[PDB]
Amino acid sequence: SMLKREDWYDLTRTTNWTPKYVTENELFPEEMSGARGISMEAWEKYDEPYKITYPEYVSIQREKDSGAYSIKAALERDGFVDRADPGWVSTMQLHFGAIALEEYAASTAEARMARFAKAPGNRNMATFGMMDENRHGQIQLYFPYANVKRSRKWDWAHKAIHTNEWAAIAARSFFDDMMMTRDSVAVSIMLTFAFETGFSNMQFLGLAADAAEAGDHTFASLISSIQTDESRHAQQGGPSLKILVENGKKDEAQQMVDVAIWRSWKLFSALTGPIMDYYTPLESRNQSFKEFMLEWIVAQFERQLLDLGLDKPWYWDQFMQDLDETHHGMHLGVWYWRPTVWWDPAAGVSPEEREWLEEKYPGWNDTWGQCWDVITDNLVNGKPELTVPETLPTICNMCNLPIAHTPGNKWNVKDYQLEYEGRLYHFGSEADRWCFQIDPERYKNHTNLVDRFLKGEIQPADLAGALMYMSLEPGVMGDDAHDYEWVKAYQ
Amino acid sequence: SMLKREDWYDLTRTTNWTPKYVTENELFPEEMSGARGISMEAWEKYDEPYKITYPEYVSIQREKDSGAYSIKAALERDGFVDRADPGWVSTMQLHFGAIALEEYAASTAEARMARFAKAPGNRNMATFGMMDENRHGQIQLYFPYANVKRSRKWDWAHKAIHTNEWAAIAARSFFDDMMMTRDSVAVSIMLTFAFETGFSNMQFLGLAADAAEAGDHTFASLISSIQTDESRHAQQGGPSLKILVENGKKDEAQQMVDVAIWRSWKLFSALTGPIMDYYTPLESRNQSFKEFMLEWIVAQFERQLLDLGLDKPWYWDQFMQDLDETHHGMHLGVWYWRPTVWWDPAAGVSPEEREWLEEKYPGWNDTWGQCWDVITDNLVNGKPELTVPETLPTICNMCNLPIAHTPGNKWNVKDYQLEYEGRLYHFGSEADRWCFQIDPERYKNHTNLVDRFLKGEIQPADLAGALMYMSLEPGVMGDDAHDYEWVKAYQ
Amino acid sequence: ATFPIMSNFERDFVIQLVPVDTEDTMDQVAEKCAYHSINRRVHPQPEKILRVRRHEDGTLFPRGMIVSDAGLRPTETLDIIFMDN
Amino acid sequence: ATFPIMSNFERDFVIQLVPVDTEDTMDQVAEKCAYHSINRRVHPQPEKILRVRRHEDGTLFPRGMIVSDAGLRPTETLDIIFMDN
Amino acid sequence: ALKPLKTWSHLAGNRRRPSEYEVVSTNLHYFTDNPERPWELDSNLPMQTWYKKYCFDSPLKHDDWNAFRDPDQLVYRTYNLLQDGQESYVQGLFDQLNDRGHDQMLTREWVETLARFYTPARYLFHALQMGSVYIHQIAPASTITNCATYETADHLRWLTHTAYRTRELANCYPDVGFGKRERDVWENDPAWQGFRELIEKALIAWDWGEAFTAINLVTKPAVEEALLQQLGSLAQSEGDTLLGLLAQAQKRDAERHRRWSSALVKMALEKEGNREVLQKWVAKWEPLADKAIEAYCSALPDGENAIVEAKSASRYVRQMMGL
Amino acid sequence: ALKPLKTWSHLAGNRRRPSEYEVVSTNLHYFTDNPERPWELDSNLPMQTWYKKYCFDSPLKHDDWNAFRDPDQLVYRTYNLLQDGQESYVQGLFDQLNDRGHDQMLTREWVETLARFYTPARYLFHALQMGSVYIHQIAPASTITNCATYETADHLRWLTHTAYRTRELANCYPDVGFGKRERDVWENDPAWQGFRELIEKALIAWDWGEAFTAINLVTKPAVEEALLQQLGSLAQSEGDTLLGLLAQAQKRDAERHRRWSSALVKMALEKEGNREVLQKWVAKWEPLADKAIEAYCSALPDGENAIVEAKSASRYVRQMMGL
Ligand SMILES: [Fe+3]
Ligand SMILES: [Fe+3]
Ligand SMILES: [Fe+3]
Ligand SMILES: [Fe+3]
């Protein structure tokens, strides 16, 4: 006969002991563990709510790969990717480039907690977490690899995070700050609670439904399988946050949460938002980016925060207002600067798309629509050269994204500048500037792509020079995803 | 360490012994074993060329189901079946009804060899063979079951072989004769060599390519997985045939082969032939039924027969000629008698289909085309009642299919009648009549559906009565698969 | 008087069960057979006369000879052919 | 004499890097900024005059005042707005 | 027009939505549709007569044999999940005890006991495989067939373990005659003749109900208690840890065969007269099983006690079914 | 325009078309792109300094650490295929020896030996798990990281076996203190203090190369020879067939960790000065391993011989790497 899990599970995490040949602070250096003056004994109250053991893991995860790799192999000769909507192809090329190496890099973020957390249950769940992200990095390399012969773009599944292309820099800036350069407890909060529980878990659910709506069952099955791993390791921040709140550290806990939710949101509104509102074909749009946010992300945070004895972040009302704006800016930025990304952006501003936009966001045509009006006229009138840039946009020193916001009849673009130790910094929001001022030595001598251009680091110091600096050449440089087909509706 | 398979494999089939408490003839009754005066020792020369052992079987077959059932589950919500070409839906409804319970019934045909073969290697391969057909029957019930709510037709996956509908009777007539009512050695020859090696192995390969061409990856993966099991048990007749030829029984071996290839062909030309030449949409047709036969079935038989010291069957030249004709008749029969089958037959005689038919079979329009001309005129002119029958076709007493052949300008329909013990029998070919005369007591008092109608067994003795006798009601009774859409091309 | 025959109609593709009467002439046998072929899958030939012959040996029956006198086996197969006479 | 500023052009959606010259007037700063916005994503307004103001405190610079005299930090953000004067 | 149903028509109105097991296993034999002419051919063929006599005319009777359900609910897919795990265990034992030189540590005496009492089972296990695969092809319902299907595959599993260990034993003790001698021991050694007579006779009991009783109710319990229970305990006490574990692993298959046999006997006892039909068959075959057990176990060390225990343990199987 | 390639750009021109292992494992760390500022933040943060000091400045040097290849070529998918089979074996042992009452047959003496020498390993095995997972996060190439990834998961596998058997032992011998006492034995029993000192010190060796050497070349061979080789043989001779088999099953993981460690040392010896760098680290840690082995094995029966064998077997691991 076999025991029941519950009868022996606790012994798997009864692993703390009182070191004697080295000190506690040597074995758990505070810069790696982040125990924050809370004792080993108080950290042992950590109790993960989703439990699992080694033999259950290897059996359940073996069956996941069997299923996902079988689907991929059965569908591979059909070549769906060669007849997919090109907004869909672009969605995948963006996804793989931005995420595959960061999933893999996460495994190290998990390894940080596995070694350095004082909470023994955290150390073992993060060992499974480390295994999960090893899987995610690998499978998200093996899948796009099937397409390398289809186009170079697919090489960016591996190459992107090794470049200085500006979207890659924004990705590392986010990930290195949440998960690679922080103590174990901070990683549990900032990555697993704020970002994985808070955004990516629901983002992968939507992405899998979108892939099946587009007729891509390989990718639907891939994303869907990866999503089922999330909660096993995403759960790790909740218990760390309860311990910090019970032991007189609610302010520190609050501050980590505030920073991580804001920084998550800026990356998410730049890369997911435009996908939902512009790349997915009109008749496949279940809901708007803003609707997705209100239904599946925002209430969930409020409920988590409430259950944890924490508050809504100071910027919550601004954040709500930004749902009508931020991603419309990042889309227009990426489309207008399209040769600077490694996928083809879909404009998404046909007459029917613009009426959808107007229903979903009253005022869009009066604001966003104005810039697209000018761009559309130039394309109708054979001046395509006025639809690509001859300078760099200003970049935020925190999120490393363009500083952009409402244009047209309700102009509202602002720069949250900061002078600090003799240098002038630019920030795209009040919260971005605040992440910097609460912790200036974490960010001070970082330079964004604009900083580098201005300092002489990009040579030749011109647009062709900046493209080479970003590893971008013709064949990978982006262009309009439908080859300007939608311009016909305007003549 | 583990042994290598080859070092111990022979001991798995070193299982014959010299009975003493019962006699050899009691333990292996000749009517079940068919040892044919060839000794136990001479039967031990049996040597299957594809070897496998219990632990290899359960591991390799576990992974097959993991893959097939995973594909099915990932694709099920997409509901491909609701937008498939209706010639494709019909192809699957026919497939499941005709085959699922015969696959299962096969397991018993395998069990017959597992118990009764004197060749110990045959007994163990047939134990795997029994397992294989258990799988095929089960998985070919589980797959169509997903569709029962879509329409009654899908209930016929289970129900068909429990009815007296005429196609089901033709199916049992074939299967009961090749595999359910014969001695072990005869089953190895007649089923595994003539029918599985000779037809169904290549038929499932083509069917899987057609399903993927139609965009049905669930069904492509199902058929494709089942096909990979075939050779493990299909191999069993070759060695039985070598033993019979080496031991003075080449004439008996020849005769079993001649019967089984002819009877296989009549079922195959009735159910597969029309599928390739009429149900699969024009632009998906890789090759013609006749081309399929010449490339993938006929040369393969000739090569097998040669390697075995056997001859081409006496009817081989006739059989070649029939490739231009037989299935065109069975199609026209099934479409004209469409309310008597449980799927919707696709006419397949649009102008573009008829030019394809004319390229593939020069003379088609001058022959087959004549009957379709009359039918098409009646549909154009609003006399649909002249396109459904008011009598029964004559049925062959051997294959239980309609007696049909070349019509129009090269009329060649013949009945191979036989008077025998006071009763008149009808046969659709010279080989059908010959299968009866070489073994009249195997068939004598069987009655076909026509015989039964004429004897008073079908009551009320009219067409409505015959439909109820066949378990057919509105909702399952067939009609034109495209709802006569193709009549528009003629006005 | 009802008697079953199998009709193999000229230029059709299939043999069919046709009940006839032991008192029918051959002309009346052909008309009962035509009903199941002419204008279904075979074009009329109004310049021709339908004749009945025993499928098995090719014996041509006269138009006016009746089923009763024809020496047929129940279910016997009959060719129904187009002739000038 | 080359000096970098960030241009926040009225009714555009984005702030852009615009090299200007320390000897440019504000009028000449606005023209260098317009090049990257007017007829790209913003409609001309020929009845209006482009003016330059310090983004941070809202200080309006006169048309004729030069970059040299304006007290700007390198990379300072400038609003380029449509006025009657 | 007929409306689509929620399940197969033959299961409509079950209240409970049918399991995978029901969906793929029920009501599949079609030879039982026409008891006067099972097969779609002439009604006087030998195989028509065989099924009329040995299936339809069996004195073991029920109005609805298709109602039978395996208590383990096995289908092909779950059979292979289950047995693939059990073989990872057994194949792991083989591999790791070989790595350890387990066979080199057996005494010469025990090696000789294996040649006599262990390896010639390849014949008895193959005979059971023929036995249960006959039950498959003559039983009256597909759910009864399938239990016999999977039991056959298990009997082949036991043959296969025995064949593999025979070759490893021959490699380690090339002078003993492992692999060469077993046919002569099965044919001529008095310790095997009780079993050899029992299984040769049981293999020509063609009536399905009698085949079920002779193979599953009488022969298997006797074979399993002698060769798995008694030889396995002996193995373990003699230092053969491989065989003590192998035998116990194979006994899990045998317990599953007993569960379905017990369910079938339960279903049969719903009908008056069947208990007696079964008891009469048991009484004809039991004395052959006693002889089998006496000849084999008496030749083992502590023979008389092995006989007493195998006899009562095999009787206990049938008594708990209410026989 | 750039033409599509047949593989990833970083593997173009390999002659051989890249395996799955190469496609998913190579050249994935990006902190090594900018040795002056590993992370995309201010260059003076603590974690920038940690990686500069403990990764880039290690005296164990190579121009292309990304060239390293696991000789077992493990990826996540094949890791779980492999370990799922090995756990079907071990979990099958647990289940079937429990069915047999294996723990009831141990002598009181041996039960007391388990409480002392077996179950407190949950601490030493978790310490190794922390040890190899530190190697993961500070090593210079993703293919080196991944070997440490899968080795960590194995160390957690050994902890998990030990936790499970601790509870079964407590159920069978509730008076012994299984599950309650192990922390006090690990902290205070002289037989554990050589190991406890070795692993506490090794766990603060932050330099990646020294972490590799202290955990994988010196500590693991000593832990594996004492607790798996010597305690397992003892277990088997004392009638504990479960632990004799468990230990040997865990030793297969340890042999795989030795294979990749040996490959890495081979790659390091391509570079002048590295053999000496490694030998110097070995010489600093070896005396702690000797003490560990002496304190633990001397307290076992036949202590002095267990010490002699564990010492030479653990030295032999390193000598065959050319150290
Ligand atoms: Fe992940
Ligand atoms: Fe994650
Ligand atoms: Fe099959
Ligand atoms: Fe088959």
Q: Do A411 and D10 touch (CB under 8 A)?
A: yes
Which tokens sit at A100? 């595959």
Which tokens sit at B204? 């499932």
Contact B44, B90 (CB under 8 A): no
- Which residue's structure tokens are 């139609």? B214
Measured distance CA(F189)–CA(B143) in Å, rounded: 63
- Which residue's structure tokens are 């983004």? D55
Burial (0-12, 13-18, 19+ Cβ within 10 Å), F115:
buried
Which tokens sit at A437? 């001022």
Q: Please tell me which chains touch B, using 3 or more CB pairs under 8 Å as the contact test.
A: A, C, E
Which tokens sit at D56? 């941070």
Measured distance CA(B487)–CA(B481) in Å, rounded: 12
Question: ω into residue B393 within 30 of 0, thus cis?
Answer: no
Q: Chain B within 8 Å of C14 (Cβ-Cβ)? A: yes
Beta strand D77-83 with D49-54 is antiparallel
Q: Do B374 and C76 touch (CB under 8 A)?
A: no
Measured distance CA(E280)–CA(A178) in Å, rounded: 79
Cα distance from D63 to chain A (closest Cα, Å)? 23
Residues annotated within a binding site of B for Fe(3+): 103, 133, 136, 196, 230, 233
CB atoms within 10 A of CB B25: 11
Q: What angle do CA A340, A345, A349 make, to 5 degrees?
A: 130
Phi first, then psi: give them for residue F301, nearest 5 degrees: -60, 140
Measured distance CA(E52)–CA(B285) in Å, rounded: 48
Q: Do B67 and A63 touch (CB under 8 A)?
A: no
Compute, in angstroms, the gap from residue A239 CA to the centroid of ligand 2: 17
Domain boundaries, chain F: 1-323
How many Cβ pairs closer than 8 A exist between chain B and C? 101
Kindly give, in sequence order, each residue whose CB lies less than 8 Å from that of residue E50, ignoring residues fewer than 6 positions away. B31, B32, E138, E206
User: Which H/E stretch holds residue A289?
Assistant: helix A289-292
Compute, in angstroms, the gap from residue B74 CA to the centroid of ligand 4: 27
Question: ω into residue B460 within 30 of 0, thus cis?
Answer: yes
Compute, in angstroms, the gap from residue A227 CA to the centroid of ligand 1: 8
Cα distance from E86 to chain B (closest Cα, Å)? 10
Measured distance CA(B256)–CA(B264) in Å, rounded: 12
Cα distance from E275 to chain B (closest Cα, Å)? 28
> Do you know the residue count of chain A?
491
In E66-116, which ranges are E strands? none
Entry resolution (Å)? 2.2
Q: Report CA torsion sign: F176, F181, F182, F185.
A: negative
Q: What is the DSSP string of B248-292?
A: T-HHHHHHHHHHHHHHHHHHHHHHTHHIIIIIS-GGG-SS-HHHH
Which tokens sit at E192? 């095997």
E236-242: long-range contacts, CB 8 A cutoff, minimum separation 24: E238/E106, E238/E107, E238/E110, E238/E113, E239/E105, E239/E106, E239/E107, E239/E110, E240/E106, E240/E110, E240/E114, E241/E97, E241/E102, E241/F241, E242/E93, E242/E94, E242/E97, E242/E102, E242/E103, E242/E165
> Do you know the residue count of chain F?
323
Domain boundaries, chain B: 1-491
Measured distance CA(F151)–CA(F157) in Å, rounded: 10
Least CB–CB distance from A394: residue in D17, D35, D43? D17
Which among F55, F77, F288 is the top mutation candidate for probing chain A, defined by the most A β-carbons within 10 Å of its own β-carbon?
F77
Q: Do D15 and A450 touch (CB under 8 A)?
A: no
Q: Report CA torsion sign: A104, A110, A116, A120.
A: negative
The count of structural domains within chain C is 1
Measured distance CA(E252)–CA(E153) in Å, rounded: 14
Measured distance CA(B379)–CA(A489) in Å, rounded: 43
CB atoms within 10 A of CB F101: 9
Residue C67 belongs to domain spanning? 1-85
Contact D29, D77 (CB under 8 A): no
Identify all chain B residues contacting C41, using CB atoms and an 8 Å cutoff: 332, 336, 370-371, 374-375, 407
Cα distance from E73 to chain F (closest Cα, Å)? 22
Measured distance CA(F262)–CA(C32) in Å, rounded: 94
Closest listed residue to residue B344, CA positions, set B355, B332, B334: B334
What is the C-alpha end-to-end distance of chain F, expressed in Å? 51
CB atoms within 10 A of CB B185: 30
Kindly give, in sequence order, each residue whose CB lies less than 8 Å from that of residue B485, ignoring residues fewer than 6 positions away. none
Compute, in angstroms, the gap from residue E126 CA to the centroid of ligand 3: 24
Closest listed residue to residue A318, CA positions, set A310, A309, A326: A326
Q: Which A residues in the span 346-385 are in contact with D, Cβ-Cβ below 8 Å?
A: 368, 370-371, 373-375, 378
**Residues that place a CB less than 5 A from ion ligand 1:** A 103, 133, 136
For the CA atoms of B32, B37, B39, B44, the dihedral, rounded to the nearest 10 degrees, stands at -60
Measured distance CA(B53)–CA(B61) in Å, rounded: 12
Experiment used for this model: X-ray
CATH code, residues A1-491: 1.10.620.20
Can you name the residues that pair with C66 across neighbouring β-strands? C25
Closest listed residue to residue A115, CA positions, set A15, A22, A196, A257: A15
CA distances (Å), origin A145, targets A162, A214, A460, F22, F224: 17, 20, 33, 12, 40
Measured distance CA(E246)–CA(F150) in Å, rounded: 31
CB atoms within 10 A of CB A281: 14
CA distances (Å), origin B442, targets A228, A356, B173, B181, B446: 60, 73, 11, 9, 9
Contact D2, D74 (CB under 8 A): no
Kindly give, in sequence order, each residue whose CB lies less than 8 Å from that of residue E275, ignoring residues fewer than 6 positions away. E268, E269, E322, E323
User: Which H/E stretch holds residue A306?
Assistant: helix A299-307
Q: Domain spanning E1-323: which CATH class is it, in words? A: mainly alpha
Chain A touches chain F, with at least 3 Cβ pairs below 8 Å, answer: yes
* Chain centroid to CA B93: 15
Q: What is the DSSP string of F197-214?
A: HHHHHHTT--SHHHHIII
Identify all chain E residues contacting B148, using CB atoms and an 8 Å cutoff: 4-8
Q: Please tell me which chains touch C, using 3 or more CB pairs under 8 Å as the contact test.
A: B
User: Which H/E stretch holds residue C53?
Assistant: strand C49-54
Which tokens sit at D79? 């609003």
Phi first, then psi: give them for residue A267, nearest 5 degrees: -65, -45
Measured distance CA(B198)–CA(B382) in Å, rounded: 45
Ligand index nearest the alpha carbon of residue A193: 2
Q: Chain B within 8 Å of E153 (Cβ-Cβ)? A: yes
Contact E282, E318 (CB under 8 A): yes
Closest listed residue to residue B357, CA positions, set B295, B291, B412, B428: B291
HSE-CB of E98 using CA atoms within 13 angstroms: 16
Closest listed residue to residue F143, CA positions, set F213, F71, F221: F71
